[PDB]
A paper describes a structure:
The empty structure corresponds to a postinfection state. However, the length of the tail tube remains unaltered, demonstrating that it does not contract during DNA ejection, similar to siphoviruses that infect bacteria. The [name], TMP, and baseplate are missing. Instead, a density appears to plug the capsid-facing side of the portal. Otherwise, the portal and the components of the tail tube are unchanged in width, length, and conformation, indicating a rigid structure. In the empty virus, the TMP and TDS are absent, demonstrating that they are released during DNA ejection. Genome release in [name] triggers structural changes in the distal tail region, including BPH detachment and TF dissociation.
Here, we present the near-atomic resolution structure of [name] ([name]), an archaeal virus thriving in extreme salinity. Through single-particle analysis, we obtained near-atomic resolution maps of DNA-filled and empty virions, enabling us to assemble full atomic models of the virus pre- and post-DNA release, including all structural protein components. The full atomic structure revealed that the virus has a length of 1350 Å and an icosahedral head with a diameter of ~600 Å. The tail has a length of 560 Å and terminates into a baseplate with three radiating TFs of ~190 Å in length.
Author numbering:
A (entry chain Pf), B (entry chain Pa), C (entry chain AQ), D (entry chain AP), E (entry chain AR), F (entry chain AO), ...: 2 to 157
Amino acid sequence: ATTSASHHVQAIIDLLEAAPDADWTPTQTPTVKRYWDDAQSERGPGADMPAILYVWSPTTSSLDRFSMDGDVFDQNDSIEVQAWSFDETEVEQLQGDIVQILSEYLDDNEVQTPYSDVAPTGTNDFREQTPARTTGHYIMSVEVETRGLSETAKNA
Amino acid sequence: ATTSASHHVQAIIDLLEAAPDADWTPTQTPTVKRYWDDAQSERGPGADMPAILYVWSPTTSSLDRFSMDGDVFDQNDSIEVQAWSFDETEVEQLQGDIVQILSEYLDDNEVQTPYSDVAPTGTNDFREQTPARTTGHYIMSVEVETRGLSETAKNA
Amino acid sequence: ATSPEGIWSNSGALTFEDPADDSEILFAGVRDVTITPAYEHAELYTIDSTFRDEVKRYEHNVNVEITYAKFSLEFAQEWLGGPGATATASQDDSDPMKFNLENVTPSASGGFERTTAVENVVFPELPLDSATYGEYEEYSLTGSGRSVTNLADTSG
Amino acid sequence: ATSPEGIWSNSGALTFEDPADDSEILFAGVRDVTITPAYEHAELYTIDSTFRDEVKRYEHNVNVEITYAKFSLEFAQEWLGGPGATATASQDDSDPMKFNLENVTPSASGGFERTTAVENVVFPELPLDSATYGEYEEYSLTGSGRSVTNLADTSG
Amino acid sequence: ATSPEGIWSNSGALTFEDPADDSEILFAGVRDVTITPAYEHAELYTIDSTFRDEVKRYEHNVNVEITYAKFSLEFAQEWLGGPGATATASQDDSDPMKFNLENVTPSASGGFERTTAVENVVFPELPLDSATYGEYEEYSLTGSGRSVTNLADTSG
Amino acid sequence: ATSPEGIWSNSGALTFEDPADDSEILFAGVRDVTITPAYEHAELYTIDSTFRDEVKRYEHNVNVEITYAKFSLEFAQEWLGGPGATATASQDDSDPMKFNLENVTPSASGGFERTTAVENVVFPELPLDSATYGEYEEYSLTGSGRSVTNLADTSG
Amino acid sequence: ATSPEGIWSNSGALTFEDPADDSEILFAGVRDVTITPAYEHAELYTIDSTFRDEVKRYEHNVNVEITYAKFSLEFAQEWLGGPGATATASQDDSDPMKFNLENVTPSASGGFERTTAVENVVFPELPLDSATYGEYEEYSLTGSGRSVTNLADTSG
Amino acid sequence: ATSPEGIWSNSGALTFEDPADDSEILFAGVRDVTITPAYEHAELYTIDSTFRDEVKRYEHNVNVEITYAKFSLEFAQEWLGGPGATATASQDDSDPMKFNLENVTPSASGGFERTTAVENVVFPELPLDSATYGEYEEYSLTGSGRSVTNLADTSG
Amino acid sequence: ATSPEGIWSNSGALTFEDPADDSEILFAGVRDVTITPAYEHAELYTIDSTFRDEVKRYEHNVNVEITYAKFSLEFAQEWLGGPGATATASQDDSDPMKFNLENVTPSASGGFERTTAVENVVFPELPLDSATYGEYEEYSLTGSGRSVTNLADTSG
Amino acid sequence: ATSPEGIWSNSGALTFEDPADDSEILFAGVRDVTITPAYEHAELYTIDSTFRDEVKRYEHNVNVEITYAKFSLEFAQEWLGGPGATATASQDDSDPMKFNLENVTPSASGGFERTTAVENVVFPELPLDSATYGEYEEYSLTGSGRSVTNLADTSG
């Protein structure tokens, strides 16, 4: 229903973009991007623009055998979402928001999503890394896992 | 039947080359190569040419003892197939294609392949590595494993 | 008939009911749910033949076993109180509390929706406390239903 | 003669049939399958000798054990219904459902293909729900076939 | 009603009382605590139906099991002494020491506080020394309470 | 006498014979082989002494247990058929198939070569299928021989 | 009364004594020491009530399980010799050697000092040799004493 | 007195003797060796007291258990042959082979040398083949000695 | 003729009738039902021969014994009242209550339906209360019927 | 009429009364209770027929037997005393104490409440003491009532 994309990165982008404006804590809705939409020196928002979310798959998706039928793979998909802002409290609100938004869908039997399960499974803070002299991006992130049965065309 | 290849790398090349022009998602059938067929400065397709798949064996193949008789090895092999294109949608579609191509043969009895099992076991996305500022190849891959009973010389 | 399909566990909603009223008894937070109809089997053999002459079934019940992690004060006080009452202390009477129990579970693809219902489940023992330091409490139930009252596809 | 040979488990195609109409009962997604013809053995010893004097066999049965991961509604409604019927609830009657089981499996080399077939398999207990949080459901059967009706090479 | 809720084990406060004078017997440092009211169940079955015809309960007791790490001389000298007395050696008499046990535990959310209270707990065996080199001593109790005197929300 | 020495398991060659003809029954691909002569022991004690007065042996047999991984269609059809016949289906008769069994094993340094021979091994139960998904089938036998007919150094 | 407190195992000193003399029998090198007073419990139930009418204790003993790593030639020769003698061989007589046992253990903070004394400990079986290649020998004792003669705070 | 001391397992020298001619039977390659003199204990209790009134020992034996990795034809052909004979096949007679067993072991410091000797050890079962692919053979014995003929320090 | 066949006990329906009306008497819940027509036999022997000269029948009766677990007031009050009367207390009169009895059973494979009918069964004693702690009341009747009035296949 | 129903033994409520006063005699703690009205039957047979010609009742009594675990001084002292008197010693007189007896039980599903009453029960022997080691004293009575004075449904 809400996504039906062929790949997890676009699926999570479609879930984050589908979110109501009322379900973001800040004054304005963030902008959602594939991590490779932006060049590194441009990465993160500028001042007087809303915060930016970068989404990608950081590690290998598993394709486990489900049965002796060979009819589906138990597919486990890995994602990370980074929140970038100049506001050290906005990145924290975005982390809270992303965990909330993606805590819908948690056990879709492929209802909204093309998956059995989309879940936040961990979160990182990187605010310690932004140096204090220069204005610069604070960064925080959500780690997401995603599971489903994916067809094999073995049985025609 | 479809390969009779002497080694796993050539076997997976043969399986990908045996795919009908109907079973690829793009308009043009990709070109299949060994990773060592092209030098680095010219690896990946040029513009106005079909996308490229590079095949090689990235890690140690294992020869477990099958039984006390010593007549055969339980051979387990590993392969990576990387897809290179300038089109981020095309590498995604190629990854899905390689998975649903190499999911034929999932449980052969040395019928098509010379193996008991050829399986996609994982998938990698590397699109986040491509700098956005330049034109440049996106890369995605399928990791595929292969298992079979491989004859010894012991009993002549 | 309906194609067999895998099932994502968490999609299953379990509910307990008072058989006097069909009212719900609040219960939540399951981690395992095993429901297993059984009969005793008697096989006939005689000096005529080494093969079984006949087989027959008797002593029907349904094994119900549950692991869960949300404590229910209503469910416990029902189990103490026995049929048609609640109690804050052990009751010196001969009747166990009988629960109707229903589990509704969408298939992985939504291909069907299994509704299982069990009449007159009773539990020989009830954990009230199940503490381990540095963890949340987790509780195990074993019980026995009289029969399965429904096992049907309830999709559409 | 036919040379002894290894067997890749996944190559086996398992089916159940109704022994009345010879119709297939839909079942799928096995993970383990054990079929074991057995007899009770009785041994004669006497004061004449410390060695066994005679041995004889009686009570033939075939132990059938299956682990499976795709739920079949038809299989369960057959089991509930008993011979020549299907039901949506426990039946108060003495006849268990009897399934014919056939399993056909090529050699790893393709050098033979055993067909194993078992008459009048019955299951004392049937798992209806077998849910564990964060996993797909998995189910076990244990049952007794009357005898092996076929064990031969069906290749060629 | 009161909503079902998770429980953090460590929030629980456990105490033993002498049932004569309602004085506390000093005990501390638990690691696991299990309290399980039980009954024996008798099920009636007869030739006229394969389903259970009646079920009844008898032999109430409460299983109490405790793991603990702080030794108490008072608890042990009570257990040796038997009812209404303390002793520094085994007593040759037929009355075991009977403890009232009370465990008071908040919900993880603070939404309720279950008090569980058990009369006349007796322990068949008592660990006095339980040493293992390079560790602190740890002890286990198993015992039977007569009944639950209280199970209610004591919040507010 | 001959120096005791360690033994490399795989050096052992196991063979099965029809006792009617001394013809070989094709069997291969073992993983484990246990052959253990046994007797029951009766020890005599009386009021005159706390020490054993006598000890005696009776009920000789040889335990034979085998794990193996190459399926033999001949061996299975012999076990079905009983003495002096083969069958493709269970036989309704009282005689188990009796196998003569011999294991010949060179010592680690070639210092000796034991031949162990067991007469009239019978197996109460025979695995046919023994599937696990994503593995080759592995089979376990337990049986009992009447006596050891030979245990000697075969070397030179 | 004395505050309950944890105990560091190794601070416990264990000693054995000949009950004829109160002389020490040399023993050392314990790894585990479990001392557990026990009784058999008889609970009365009648048709009057589901609750226990009465409970009573009988058949007192103390379990004494010890694991140790220093072999004592005196302790073993006492156990052979029986009461009031030592022997270098099995004795054909009806009396087991009885050891008085005492364990003295300071509390973790020195808050108290447990002395536990057990009279007439006897051991049904004694390991003399307990070899494992590439380790020091380790010995397990199980025995039982008649009663606890002392359990007191020894401090000050 | 002699101070209790640790024992390095591998310093143990183990031997078997024929009790007729006092000749050694060749045995080697031990891995574990357990020697445990034991008695059955009978305890008297009566209505007079809850404490043990009397305890007595009877039915003495020595449990001997051995794990070993070097096969011996002499040991096996003695076990087959029975007292005062060797045989290359099972014997149909009632006398088990009786071995004297002696084990000698210095303490870790050389402060004593424990010599343990056991009369008339008998083994109910003997492993002849104990193969497992990719390993050397390992064998186990369990048997009963009549009594300990020696337990002393043989140093000096 | 009709083939012999097994009969499953639980398939039997037992009924009692008042021979004044052919009205049914409510009775239920059997567990055992034994019916045995019998005669006294007299054998003639004389000095002429060691073999039996003749044998003859007399004193026909049918032993009926039933165990059942559902109590019936109607059945008990008919037995109290005697022929053609129902009573709530012992009657001082000489006529016992005579019941007609019929038991109907399908054979295990439906080859026939055996109906046994017995006239004028009388029971010398009637268990009114048959209470045992922790069990349902189980009542055993023993009595003599006059004759078997029907024994036939009552199937289609 | 009223449907037959199970009865649960622990729902009994046996009471005794003095027939002189209708005063209750204190009695408690039953575990088994059998009440069986009976008559002697005489059957008539003659040369005319092998079947029974007549059957008649005589020598009516009610067998009462009770096993109980709480001793009663009143019950024993009434039995010693005889009718209308109480004694602390054996009385040398010919009149046995006659007890009226009543037992009441709800049926298992509450369909009826059976009351059984028996006049003039006498016990030929009374167990005063019934000590068995490690058990509560269990007492058995066997006696004969004159008649059943009542047997009815006493539910409202």
